[PDB]
């Protein structure tokens, strides 16, 4: 099932791209979250590609953009319990904006950004917002990307996309 597969990739990818402290906080959140995971084919190859490619993304985005603005505008840097559903809305609008066209590079950008949000949310332990972002990324993927993705060998497209 594609939605379940894509969900599992987000979790792994986030666990493999965080520092020590965040890795542990996220790993336990997921454990306690007690949610379903399948096995993704080529999963390891796909996660490696994503690390390389989100690396490409990060290195460029620190050149030409800053973070602080948007977290605030999202209401994510607060010690203040975050607005679950307001955040879905904006997230959804950002994805819709990101995805006016489809290709691998734009998909990469969705993982690199989701990472950035998740890591900022976790500074103050915003566990439910975090799980919310990951779930929304999963639905949206299943609603709008899956056909494009399956035309390109599925999630494994990333492996070749990246060389």
């Amino acid at each position: 099932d594609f939605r379940l597969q894509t969900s599992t990739l987000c979790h792994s990818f986030l666990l493999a791209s965080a520092n020590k402290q965040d890795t542990d906080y996220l790993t336990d959140l997921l454990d306690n979250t007690n949610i379903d995971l399948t096995c993704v084919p080529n999963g390891q190859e796909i996660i490696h590609s994503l690390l390389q490619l989100v690396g490409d993304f990060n290195q460029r985005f620190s050149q030409t953009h800053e973070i602080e603005p948007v977290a605030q505008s999202l209401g994510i840097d607060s010690d203040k319990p975050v607005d679950k559903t307001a955040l879905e809305i904006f997230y959804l609008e950002i994805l819709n904006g990101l995805f006016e066209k489809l290709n691998w590079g734009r998909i990469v950008a969705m993982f690199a950004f989701l990472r950035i949000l998740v890591l900022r949310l976790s500074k103050h332990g915003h566990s439910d917002a975090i799980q919310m972002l990951i779930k929304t990324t999963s639905q949206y993927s299943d609603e709008k990307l899956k056909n494009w993705i399956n035309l390109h060998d599925g999630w494994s497209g990333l492996i070749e996309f990246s060389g």
Partner: peptide, 24 residues
Amino acid sequence: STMGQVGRQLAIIGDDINRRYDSE
């Protein structure tokens, strides 16, 4: 819209990545 804008800033970086990785 406001957040839509964000998505396209993200989109340009995406398209740069996409271009570079084309087998060209």
